[PDB]
Amino acid sequence: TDQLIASVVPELLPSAELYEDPPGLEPLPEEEPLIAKSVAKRRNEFITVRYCARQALSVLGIPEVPILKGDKGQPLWPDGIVGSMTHTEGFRGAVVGRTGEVRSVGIDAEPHDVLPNGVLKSIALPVERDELDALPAGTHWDRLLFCAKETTYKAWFPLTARWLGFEDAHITIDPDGTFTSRILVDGRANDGTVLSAFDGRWIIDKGLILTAIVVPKL
Amino acid sequence: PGHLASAIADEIRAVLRSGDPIDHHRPLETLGLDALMGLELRNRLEASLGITLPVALVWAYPTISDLATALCERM
Numbered sequence: 587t588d589q590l591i592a593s594v595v596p597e598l599l600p601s602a603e604l605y606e607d608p609p610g611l612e613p614l615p616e617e618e619p620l621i622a623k624s625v626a627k628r629r630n631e632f633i634t635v636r637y638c639a640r641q642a643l644s645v646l647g648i649p650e651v652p653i654l655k656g657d658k659g660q661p662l663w664p665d666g667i668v669g670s671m672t673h674t675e676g677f678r679g680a681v682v683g684r685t686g687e688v689r690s691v692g693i694d695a696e697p698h699d700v701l702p703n704g705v706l707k708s709i710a711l712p713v714e715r716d717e718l719d720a721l722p723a724g725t726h727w728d729r730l731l732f733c734a735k736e737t738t739y740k741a742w743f744p745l746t747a748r749w750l751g752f753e754d755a756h757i758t759i760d761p762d763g764t765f766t767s768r769i770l771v772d773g774r775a776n777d778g779t780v781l782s783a784f785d786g787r788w789i790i791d792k793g794l795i796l797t798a799i800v801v802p803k804l
Numbered sequence: 805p806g807h808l809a810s811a812i813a814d815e816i817r818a819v820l821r822s823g824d825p826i827d828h829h830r831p832l833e834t835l836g837l838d839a840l841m842g843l844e845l846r847n848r849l850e851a852s853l854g855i856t857l858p859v860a861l862v863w864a865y866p867t868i869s870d871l872a873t874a875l876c877e878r879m
């Protein structure tokens with residue numbers, strides 16, 4: 587499977603992705619007021635990514651259902667379903683799962699490119715910038731660090747409903763396509779478990795970085 | 805807050821790379837601002853205003869007016 591998301595998450599979690607905005611897509615009526623005043627780019631990426639999500643949802647048996655946004659913008663999934671969506675230029679992706687098998691999932695997409703000026707300093711711990719320099723050349727480790735941190739937050743928030751700052755997570759990137767997220771604050775979950783470390787995966791292809799984190803049922 | 809509101813609007817069009825006037829009560833996500841652009845904007849406000857501003861405030865106050873008034877209380 588040459589698909590980015592399907593290559594870094596288990597097959598148990600159906601995923602769907604698109605690299606353009608196919609003509610004729612539209613939002614569900616309950617979703618239109620969410621983008622009723624947004625510009626063309628924000629509208630297209632919103633509609634296309636939710637098409638991928640609903641396609642991945644029907645693999646799990648879930649029929650056509652609107653996907654709205656919560657208080658902090660998180661996607662509001664049907665009861666029992668946990669998912670994640672991401673969209674950047676040239677990519678729209680979505681993955682869903684049942685909480686009977688996975689408790690959370692997060693994915694993030696970024697162009698394989700150096701971060702803009704000044705961003706790496708505000709999102710990386712001093713120990714992280716040193717580790718990124720020691721990594722082998724040929725890979726924009728700075729943005730792989732940024733995108734993996736967004737994935738850390740996207741898996742953290744649905745099990746926590748609390749803020750996680752860039753300074754609150756220590757990410758160690760391994761060149762073999764894996765990475766770990768070490769949470770530096772107290773990770774109280776709504777379940778009662780403490781969340782201290784995440785296991786992640788990443789892939790670079792077609793000028794795109796894609797990071798993904800799946801928590802296990804334990 | 806009105807003097808700073810138009811000052812954030814100048815910075816927003818610099819990260820958004822546009823030249824259109826911005827309604828001060830329209831959320832910036834509807835204009836195409838994403839997480840990376842919000843970090844860019846935050847660093848440009850920290851420079852222009854010379855004050856340490858946390859990143860979580862850009863989305864706690866998702867409009868220009870919501871951001872401007874929250875910033876003068878940081879003065």
Ligand SMILES: CCNC(=N)NC(=O)Nc1c(CC)cccc1CC
Pocket residue numbers: 659735736738739740750751752753755838839840842843859863
């Ligand atoms: C490990 C810590 N990293 C994060 N907390 N990252 C985000 O919060 N990113 C983000 C933001 C903040 C700029 C706004 C809207 C949407 C997103 C991504 C869902």
Ligand SMILES: [Mn+2]
Pocket residue numbers: 672673674838
């Ligand atoms: Mn996006």
Ligand SMILES: [Mn+2]
Pocket residue numbers: 672694695736839
């Ligand atoms: Mn992102």
